[PDB]
Amino acid sequence: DVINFISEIANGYSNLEYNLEEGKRGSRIAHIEKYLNELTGAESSFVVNNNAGAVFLVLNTLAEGKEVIISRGELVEIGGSFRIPDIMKK
Amino acid sequence: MKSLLRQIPQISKVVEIFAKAYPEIYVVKAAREVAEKYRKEIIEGARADLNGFLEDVERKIKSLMKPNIKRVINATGVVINTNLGRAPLSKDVINFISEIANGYSNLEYNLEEGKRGSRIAHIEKYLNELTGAESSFVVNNNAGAVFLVLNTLAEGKEVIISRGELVEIGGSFRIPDIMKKSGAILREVGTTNKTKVSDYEGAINQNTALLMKVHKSNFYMEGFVEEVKLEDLVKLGHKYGIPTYYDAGSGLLINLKEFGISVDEPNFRDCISLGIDLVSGSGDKLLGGPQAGIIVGKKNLIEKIKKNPIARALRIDKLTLSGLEMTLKLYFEKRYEDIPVIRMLTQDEKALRQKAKRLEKLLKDIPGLKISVIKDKAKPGGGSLPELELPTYCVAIRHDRLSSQELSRRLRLAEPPIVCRIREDQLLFDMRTVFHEDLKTIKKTLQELLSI
RNA sequence: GGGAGUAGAUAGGCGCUGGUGUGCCUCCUAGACUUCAAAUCUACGGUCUCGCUAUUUAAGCGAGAGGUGGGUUCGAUUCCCACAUACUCCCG
Known about the structure:
The structure is cut from a larger assembly and holds 2 copies of chain A.
Chain A lengths: L1 H10 L6 E2 L4 E2 L4 H11 L10 H12 L21 H6 L1
Antiparallel strand pairs in A: 1-2
Chain B binds one RNA strand through helix 15 and strand 14.
């Protein structure tokens, strides 16, 4: 069901960054978010490439140059190149 | 309200009420303790009656005449029970200790030269032989063993250790909290679940005075988890000229596979013959002896540790020293079955059921008892072997009148007190840890609680 | 025993709804229709209590209770919270 919906939107042009209502460019992240806030119950949402970057982005966004407290048992290494300590540093 | 308290009798009066009833000393102590509990309960206005007084005062006396610390029958099936006093001692050892404590001894006296001598000298001979290390030493416990090695060799300098090995064993011990107090600077490498060799070699520098690895004794990690082999750390040390210090913790003196139990638990002899410069561990864990911090390794290091002015505040007492030598003597003589901890874990599966049913035969008569023997898989090691899971026969019991919860509670109040597992409202007794002379004590306790 | 999940009616079993509750099934009864059965159809229907008239009772009338309490709200059966209780799952 999903593979076909993707198949269709990729076959040609789509309203990716276009809001059909106002006829001017629009945020592509806007289509989904409606779903997320409803399912999660959160106030707003957003999505990026992967969770690796999701972390990276939250950290550089809210704690660049400032301290972040985390348990010494939660400094994981998931995957071959991901490590909470190595990325948070970056 | 100042008359609801004037009431309470006088200690002179109560002492009378117990002329020959109980020693006058114990009577007054219980009266005081009791007299205070009634003055406060009446001042806060929580008591309107004082009749409970007489009955209670006598209960304190019955209690106060009994020491706080008391032998307890362990039915949990956990050999290294941190709570119940870890490794119990063979009578052979208990007697050798008994003898040296009865009077004076050559503790710090060398009979040869007739002048004072180091008390640590009696044992060390044993250690260097069993481990194969160049020199050895022992202190109060392994907690301090670590503390001493760190303040001795890395005060003010860096010590590299895996981020997955910064453990918290016990309630107050934490590698990070003590090393800090140790004066050593902590350099944690790798990540929780994984740590390659690159991580170690990457953090070395001018200040790196020590490469330390701790053995995850009271916990384990499964799933994506990587660890740095010991041979690698030795190689790493010898390349940069840095010492290697292993805190085994378990204090396993020998290869464990030789007894049928297949585990990767590390041991002194092997760890030392591996190229490790220093190794430590508790005596009351996998060694089966009294509490003691044991250190073995290169001579030049041992000498450095001994000279430390702090070693005198950790030097072991007369009891554990002797008791340690007799436990070491047993190991040279290959008297393995004589040390409790070892015998309990290497007991025949056959052996266990044999005791499982000899107990059930003792409880068939007692009223209301639902007796059954089940074969379950538990984890024997409490403070030294986290992963080990070995089969053992438990005699699961159940009475119609009282509930399993209430059951465990009265059993801990018995004399002697018995501690056992609870699983699904059914009391269980693992025979892995039960001594034979307890079986008779078990039956006499149960029939005295259900029929009285 | 400690955790956690599921939960709840105002006739009874299953489900839903911030508009003063509601849908499917059942029971009952009532009624209609039937030679019969069956089928079918219909019901601001139904408990409890209290107060009022009648007062054997009915019968009528009025009010309220959704485990209990509280809060938000214009409105709470819904939402939130707290407690209690029932069913189930994880641990000692």
